[PDB]
Amino acid sequence: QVCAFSGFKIPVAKGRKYVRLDLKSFTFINKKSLMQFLRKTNPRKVFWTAIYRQLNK
Amino acid sequence: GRQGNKFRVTCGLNNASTVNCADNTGAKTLTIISVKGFHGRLNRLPRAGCGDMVVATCKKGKPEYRKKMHTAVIIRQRRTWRRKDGVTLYFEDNAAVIVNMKGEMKGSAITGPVSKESADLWPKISSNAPTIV
Amino acid sequence: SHRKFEAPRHGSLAFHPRKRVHKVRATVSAFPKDNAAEKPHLTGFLGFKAGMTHVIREVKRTNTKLPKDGVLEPVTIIETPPMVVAGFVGYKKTTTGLKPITAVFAEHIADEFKRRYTKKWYKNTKNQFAVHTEKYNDVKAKSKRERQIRLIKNRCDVVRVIAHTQMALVPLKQKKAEVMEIQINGGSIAEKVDFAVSLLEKQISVNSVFGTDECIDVCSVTKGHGYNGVIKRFGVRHLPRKTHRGLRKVACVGAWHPARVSWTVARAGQMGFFKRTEVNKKIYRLGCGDLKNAKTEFDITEKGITPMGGFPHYGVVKNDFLMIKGTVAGIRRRVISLRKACFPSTTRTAQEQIVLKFIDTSSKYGHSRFQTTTEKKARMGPMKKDL
RNA sequence: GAUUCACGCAGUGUUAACGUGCAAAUUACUUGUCAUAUUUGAGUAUAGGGGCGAAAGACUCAUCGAACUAUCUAGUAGCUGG
RNA sequence: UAAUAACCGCAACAGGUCUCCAAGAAGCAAAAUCUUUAGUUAAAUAGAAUAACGCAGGUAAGGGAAGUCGGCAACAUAGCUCUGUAAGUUAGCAAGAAAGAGUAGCUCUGGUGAUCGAAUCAGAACUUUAAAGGUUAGGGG
RNA sequence: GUCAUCUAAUUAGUGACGCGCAUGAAUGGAUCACCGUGAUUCCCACUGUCCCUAUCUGCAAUCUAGUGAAACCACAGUCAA
RNA sequence: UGUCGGCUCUUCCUAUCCAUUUCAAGCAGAAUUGAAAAAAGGUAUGAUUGUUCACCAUUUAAUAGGGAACGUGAGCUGGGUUUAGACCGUCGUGAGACAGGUUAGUUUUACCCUACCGUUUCGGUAGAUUUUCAAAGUAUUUAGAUAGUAGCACAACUCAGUACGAGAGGAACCGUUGUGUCACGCCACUGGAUUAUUCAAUUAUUUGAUCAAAUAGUGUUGAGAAUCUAACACGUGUUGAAAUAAUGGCUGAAAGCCUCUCAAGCCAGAAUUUCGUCUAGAUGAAUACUUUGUCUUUUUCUUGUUACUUUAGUACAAUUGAAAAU
RNA sequence: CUGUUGCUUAUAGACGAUGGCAUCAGAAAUCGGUGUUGUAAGCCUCUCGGGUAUUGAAUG
After folding, report:
1. Which GO biological process categories is it annotated with (chain B) (predicted)?
2. Residue C189, SS3?
3. What are the residue ranges of helices labelled H in chain C?
4. d(CA A44, CA B10)
5. CB proximity C371 to A under 8 Å
6. C368 interfaces chain A, CB cutoff of 8 Å
7. Which of B101, B107, B25 is nearest to B66 (CA)?
8. Where are the beta strands (DSSP E) in chain B?
9. How far apart are CA C342 and CA C331, in angstroms?
10. Chain A partners of B83 at a C-beta cutoff of 8 Å?
11. Chain B: closest CA distance from residue C300 (Å)
12. Quick count: other Cβ atoms within 10 Å of Cβ B9?
């Protein structure tokens, strides 16, 4: 599984899954990523996420 | 109408908890009064989790449903519960659908996802659910 | 007047008095019942709780609704380096209980064993077993040893070996060994003493005592907590916010006319350092020989049982170990007395074969992500620090 | 003789603290009030079957359903104690 | 001296006791908060440890008064601008009813005068962690 | 008290009824806008009140050096009958 | 002698509501009804009322009845009652009265003895002499008189739409799988707290500005390791033998037959009892080392013990005590 | 032999007690591993940077 926000590889039996009313479910590696997703923070603007590092270099 | 066993699901819904009604039968919200199968303990309020049968009163809805006691099955809850395969998940809101003792749904459709816990116990709910999560 | 509503009593009366032990090691109160129609064997061992991790195991039980991809369960790692047998003791059944008749010791005794007989080693003369070793081969002492063997073979019913650990094989700062008596269950008293005689000065590994997927009993001392109130010691209900003089106490400590406070009332006092025995603890991995790693058949990456960054507050496990399902009493580094099942479990889950799909070895501090330190460097890439 | 905040003052609640106390009535927070029927100093007037009282038998020097002090007075006691 | 030690309360008592003078920031404000001149670091002793039970101050998953005699206590609302504001009414009010939107930083433009100057108001780009809220600061029907 | 309404459930609240133990007209009767650190009931919102407790800080309590009281006290201090 | 109730908590009774074992029925099944063994385990959530009580709405296997100074106020609370203010109704000429109503009304002290819960300190159990022995001191390994005791309950599948029944309806044993609660734990995973004032951002003030800070007693917010912890995470108590109670039976007299026995002798049968297992624990035992070898008291050294030192006194190897069962 | 004392000692803890070591002892920095935050200061790039990290974490 891949974290929705950070894009990291979630280790087995770790993290939490969030299911929304629009039939979409997300999995997060920790609480730090979960809150950033809940704040609608763009992962492209967060430096440590894997999404950001793929965009440049 | 309940079929099979259910694994430990932490019960995040208490007595007097207000849940939404995902059915289309004119009921907006239901407030939990009691839980079927609950074993009382001193000073303990009844607890309901996903896939549990509850006694609820409709305080908001159509006249044929308001101010009346119904029976409903919890299909999702905001409380975080962990599956047996080490999967930890929770839903956006607490919802329920009105079913009778025989286990058939009074409604004909369900809005939103339905937990696998409630779909396995009640086959009639799983037939009307759009997606099982 | 009767109490208005009924409720179960808080706490157990089976664990009163509630007093902390003095020694760290807990002696097993009993051993499995002897059967005289089987080969002699040892019925116990001694290990150190390294820590806990979690595993994924395939379910082999039939007619179960468990997922087919495995179930996440906790495990406890108990490091068990081989123990050294230093002697044996015979017991006789008298009308007052088991009475030790004589004890026979080996010629060579390690300094770890000798430290047990003093309270200040560095100020001692360190001459424990010195006379016993010096004249071990004397004809007068040889005949006394043979008589001791003969006496046990005639007037004894229980034979136990005296085995101790090698503290140089564990990261513990302690140097004095932990000594345990391991009862021999097997044939007659003649062939039990012969078994113990052949075991002198030899090393016994944990695989010779325990088998595969064997439910065992664990005896250890629970983690200490010091002086505690009645809410934590027993679990009574907290008083309303309006209460004068405090909330976390039992409101009524007895009726007027038993005229005294009863032993059954909840009181504040020591909770913590208690000896507890737990039975039916299944062994998930017999970490000996080829199973001393943490790799599985599904996950074939080579890795030891030690988590990334070492076991918290413990260190690194490099000897044989036991993977016990669930929890055992006591914090890391606590001595655990293992013992064969006194009442062998016969449920379907007790006989179920254990097949692990994954064993977690990520760091136990913080929210770790990597199972090995090589995969962490591989994913992170060259850091500016090194680059 | 409107509404509010502040300096001040009070004393609604916690029936909080304290309750051999900081204090023979105080402290903290919450609350109320915070100029014209307001607040306050000094001078002065009213005295015990009297005074003064937007009235609670309230206040009249920690004393009030009749102050304090001294004399009658070692008041009397079918009652309690020795 | 004129008072957290010189006065009245048995005292170097957290109580009480009439006045004069009065800097900066910020703000509507003599509010809370921080600082300058002046005063002080002593004002019924401390050190080690970091048990219970306390007194004072906080936070908390899911639920949300089911607790209780009783929402007691706590939470919550909270400044300013714009839109909007019901029944009732002694026609004066109710009213800050209720309800909704906005608010930051930086770079500019315009309006309000006198023969150089005042802080105030309005508008426009762009950026961000999307802005009264550190302190202060109505819960409503 | 009876009938409605409030709740899933109402010795509470409100609206009606009135042979009212024992209401009633300056012993003032009825009415109530605004106001109230007044009494009562219900909604919304909010929350450790509660389900059910966990945990953090300061000051104590613990121990120690110095200093150092009081209330109470026939004699005292294990129980069953 | 602090006078109601509620909250809290322990224990006790059985005239047993549930679960366990039995017998009877106007017991076909199912649901019930009467009774015996049995008090080890359970017996709930709420609206109104201060209420005990009551009455309703649920849930449950059941939501049994009571005691302990009408248990329990230096345990709480103060809603009721029950001082001093005030209002209403009735009574009284009046002051005032009302098992009439309404509203506001100070809940003090443990540091003493004991009980209970934990925690130290000092003291210590007499009859054995095979030097391979005996005894004392120190230490470990153990031992177990006694005391407590813990696991319960429900559901799902299969049995089975079977037995039974005209039909309608409608079980049960074994076996398997879960759940709830109680008990003991535990920190892997998930969540909470967080003065690592950890890292970052930010409001106000002050450092000439940057940097770097401090202050607002923890300025605030976001993330947040460690540690602690979950009613919020998760493990174990599915565990074995024998004897029993009510009862049902075998053999069998009394009493030529009969009879489970107010006879001898036996069997099966409980959430029962006792072992087994768990916790605390007395007198103890073994071994390692230091000693000592007829014996003690008073002094005395040491933190303390033992050996040890001195002056004496004392004894000196040799006939001692066994049938078992009835 | 035991006790005191030391490691501002821990698997323990109110104080006692209990557990460990006491010169091959212990303590300390430093380094490596392991975590948390989010990309330092001088001149979007240096920069997966900088800072912290036992205090009750694990090596040397």
Report:
1. translation
2. helix
3. 111-114, 130-134, 139-155, 189-198, 206-209, 230-233, 348-351, 373-380
4. 36
5. yes
6. yes
7. B25
8. 18-21, 27-35, 53-61, 69-76, 81-82, 88-91, 95-98
9. 25
10. none
11. 21
12. 20
- The label of the residue with tokens 């902390």 reads C20
The encoded tokens of residue C315 equal 């260190």
Please state whether beta strands C179-185 and C275-287 pair in parallel, antiparallel, or not at all (unpaired): unpaired
E strand map for C173-310: 179-185, 203-204, 215-221, 227-228, 269-270, 275-287
CA distance C56 to chain B (A): 8
C200: number of Cβ within 10 Å = 18
Q: Which residues in C302-330 are b (16+ Cβ under 10 Å) and which e?
A: ebbbbbbebbeebbebebbbbbbbeebbb
Question: Under 8 Å CB-to-CB from B128, ≥6 apart: which residues?
Answer: B105, B107, B108, B109, B110
Mutate: best of C58, C64, C65, C360, partner B, most B CBs <10 A: C65
d(CA C283, CA C344): 14
Tell me chain B's radius of gyration from C-alpha atoms. Answer: 14
* 3-class SS of residue C48: strand
Task: Name all chains with 3 or more CB-CB pairs below 8 Å to chain A.
Answer: B, C
**C267 pairs with which residues across the strands?**
none
Which phi and psi angles does B118 have, rounded to 5°? -75, -30
Nearest to C178 by CA among C158, C192, C164: C164
Q: What is the DSSP string of C72-95?
A: EEEEEEEE-PPEEEEEEEEEEEEB
Encoding tokens for residue B128? Answer: 């009307």
DSSP of chain A: -B-SSS--BPPTT-SEEEE-TTS-EEEESSHHHHHHHHTT--GGG-TTSHHHHHH--
- Residue B95 tokens read as 């919802």
Rounded to a whole number of angstroms, the CA Rg of chain C reads: 26
Instruction: Spell out a b/e string for C97-106, using b for 16 or more CB atoms within 10 Å of the CB, else e.
Output: eeeebbebbb
**What was the elucidation method?**
cryo-EM
Q: Which helix (H) or strand (E) holds B116?
A: helix B116-121
CB within 7 A of strand D (chain C, 226-255):
242, 244-245
Chain C residues with CB-CB distance to A12 below 8 A? 56, 72, 358, 360
Rounded Cα gap, residues B5 and A46, in angstroms? 45
Could you tell me the CA-to-CA distances from C162 to C99, C182, C201, C291 in Å, in that order? 16, 7, 10, 28
Decide: B82 and B45 in contact? Cβ < 8 Å: no
Question: Cβ of A17 and B91 within 8 Å?
Answer: no
d(CA C375, CA C379): 6
